[PDB]
UniProtKB/Swiss-Prot annotation, chain A:
PTM: Acetylated on several lysine residues in the presence of glucose.
Family membership noted in the UniProt record: Belongs to the RNA polymerase beta' chain family.
UniProt-recorded name of the protein: DNA-directed RNA polymerase subunit beta'
Biotechnology: Co-administration of salinamide and rifampicin or salinamide and myxopyronin suppresses the emergence of resistance to both antibiotics.
Function description: DNA-dependent RNA polymerase (RNAP) catalyzes the transcription of DNA into RNA using the four ribonucleoside triphosphates as substrates. Resistance to the antibiotics salinamide A, salinamide B, rifampicin, streptolydigin, CBR703, myxopyronin, and lipiarmycin can result from mutations in this protein.
Self-association and partners: The RNAP catalytic core consists of 2 alpha, 1 beta, 1 beta' and 1 omega subunit. When a sigma factor is associated with the core the holoenzyme is formed, which can initiate transcription. The rRNA transcription and antitermination complex (rrnTAC) consists of RNAP, NusA, NusB, NusE (rpsJ), NusG, SubB, ribosomal protein S4, DNA and precursor rRNA; S4 is more flexible than other subunits.
Disulfide bonds: none
Full-length numbering of the shown residues: 14 to 51 of 1407
Swiss-Prot record, chain B:
Protein name according to UniProt: DNA topoisomerase 1
Catalyzed chemical reaction(s): ATP-independent breakage of single-stranded DNA, followed by passage and rejoining
Residue spans, zinc finger C4-type: 580-611, 643-670, 692-717
Keyword hit for Magnesium: yes
CDD domains, alphabetized: TOP1Ac (cd00186), TOPRIM_TopoIA_TopoI (cd03363)
Amino acid sequence: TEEFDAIKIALASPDMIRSWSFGEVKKPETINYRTFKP
Amino acid sequence: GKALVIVESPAKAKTINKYLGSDYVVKSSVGHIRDLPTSGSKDERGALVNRMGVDPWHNWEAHYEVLPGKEKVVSELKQLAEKADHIYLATDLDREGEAIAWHLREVIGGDDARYSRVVFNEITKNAIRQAFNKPGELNIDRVNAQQARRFMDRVVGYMVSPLLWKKIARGLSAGRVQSVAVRLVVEREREIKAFVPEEFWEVDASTTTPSGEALALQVTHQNDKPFRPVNKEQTQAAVSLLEKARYSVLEREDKPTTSKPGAPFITSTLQQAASTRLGFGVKKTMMMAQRLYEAGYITYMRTDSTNLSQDAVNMVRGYISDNFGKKYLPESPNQYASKENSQEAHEAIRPSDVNVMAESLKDMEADAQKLYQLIWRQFVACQMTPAKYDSTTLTVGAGDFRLKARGRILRFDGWTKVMPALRKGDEDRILPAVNKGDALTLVELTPAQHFTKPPARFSEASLVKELEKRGIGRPSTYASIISTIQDRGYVRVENRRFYAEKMGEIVTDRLEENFRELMNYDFTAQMENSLDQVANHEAEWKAVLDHFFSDFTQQLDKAEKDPEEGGMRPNQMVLTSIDCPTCGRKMGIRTASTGVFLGCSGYALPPKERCKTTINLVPENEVLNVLEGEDAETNALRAKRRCPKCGTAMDSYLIDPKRKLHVCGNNPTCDGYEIEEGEFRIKGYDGPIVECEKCGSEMHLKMGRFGKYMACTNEECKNTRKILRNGEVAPPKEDPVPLPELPCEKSDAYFVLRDGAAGVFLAANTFPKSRETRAPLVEELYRFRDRLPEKLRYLADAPQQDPEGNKTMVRFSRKTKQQYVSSEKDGKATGWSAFYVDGKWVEGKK
Ligand SMILES: [Zn+2]
Ligand SMILES: [Zn+2]
Ligand SMILES: [Zn+2]
């Protein structure tokens, strides 16, 4: 697939992790029981 | 026998029970059981005397009454009094306690040989034993004095308030001493706003000795005149001349200094100390002092006597001799003299047992522990040896200029040891031991710029000090004056400092003009002194009441007349150029009990041409900077604009996010106004802050035909929720079905289902009045399932009864923000609850 040659590891900069995320989760709810919907 | 002791507080009951024991039954008569009427529950004069209860013309018949909820306690007390053989009235020392005791006596009856009046200044074993040993008779003279005061205050309040409603504004109030306190605050406000700060500069100098020590001085003369440069350029010139000149210490002064401890607290001194050291105002100070007294740790907190018992003096001298030792004794007691008119029979505010340290007060909240520590420290300090200081003063000369240092060094500390200063003062430093006629070497010098202080705004404690100086009110009154001036809306307290509302100025001016005798400080003092004469039994209560009432009625009947006849001038308009959004006309600046507002002259035109449009202001808050210290008030005065027509400062208000309004201090006597887009400090509406689920905007609390209700601030959104019986925020409605089939029980209304963040509840169609709310039952919902909106129908499907057969109720789980159904038996929850997990009802034990 990606044909990588090696693996690299380092600390996570906060801007980097925020760049990963597609959104913030702010409330503890998990899934509705009235309709099985998040 | 069994002897019954009646005490006002329940905590006082517990503390006194600690020392009385099994032979005595202690019953706590919570507050005033019997009082003049309050609620509504030549006919005008009849209705006035029925509202007052007091009838001044028919020799002050009083028609006392017993308030809703007191009757239970009155019944219990009567039963216990029938059981008991001797009835002991153990109210507090002061006139209020005597009035309470008289009321109790008169309700229970049997007066002559069945009531003993007990008098103790502290709730302690020795004091209580001495008090019960030889009880006193009920001192009817002090009761009469208290009744005279109460009658005066009700006469003035009820007779004046309709006059102020007619002339000035509905929803005003008045009071004898209250109005004089407002007058004091308003006079200080007028002095402050009149003030025009000058500007003056000062120079500071830095010097080293031949011995390498270092000294800092301040520069105070030029050409043998006072050094006080007016501008920057002058100051820079002075600094130049100083630097060029050569300095020598032409003056060397030295002298011992002694400082005595402060007197033990009277109530006014205790309030001033608690404000200055701990920040407690009046209400918190007296509440905590009352708790400390009722617990038994301190003597009675309403006193103007600095006297101390020989027991107290011997105890504290023992404590000092044991802990500190002989140097701090000193040889003989420190006497302190109170006013000749003071209640010298009373003691000061002191500990009941000097060895009880503040940390040991397990049952007192931390603020009360701090207040007790202050009382203890003062009491110990007052008997200790004076502190000893040695003081040095230096003067140094260069050219046309002389510059000065003063310093003190501390060598015995005895009273300062127990009672330290809050911070070091400017003279609390070490000047080095320069010689007489010494020399000095020079380091670089700093100018400073200053503006003269205006008279300082009253604090709560400094207003209490002013009242104590003039003789307006008494130790028992002070807290009530300080509270009532705020509660009645004439004065506001901010930054721990007193500020006077424009309505307070209007009412002060009107009352001074019409009722000059009532508002004059000397006549207020003379009235207080005459009440003291009554309590002495130097005067007859009814007499002085009649004299007051005759004068007051003369002044009232003059004041009622038309303004051309000479009665109270109306709330005169001041006019400004602004376009009324309803009719474009010029707009004027107006004061109501609600505040200060912008009105359109069509308000004074008959219905045909009447305009009720109004515009609503927010004042700029002054934000005094604590870090600026003494400067903070001066800079506030500097911040204000000044009126064009007069020197008086101007006060500032916000009319648009684009516009801001300035108004003169003597408004409406002065008609200057200014309008500017520049916008100093701004504020907004409030109330239970709720979030509107329909637009996310802020939602505030408002009342009216909807009574307690919550409405969103967004002008594009009119969403409204409602307050219910046992919940905050306000469920809106969404399903406000006027369920006509469910009747109210405490009233004749019918229930309506409402929704909101609190949940789904039932409320009276007249919550403003009925304010009756209860949670719906599942069977109730199933009865009216059809009327429920489409969403809530699921609640009707929930099981109606638990496995035990008990009836269920719909509840809201805030932690999960969802509705569930729970069963209750005997009013307690059965511990069974059902929620709705994925289209089916999951029931189980809670
Ligand atoms: Zn108008
Ligand atoms: Zn002016
Ligand atoms: Zn809204």
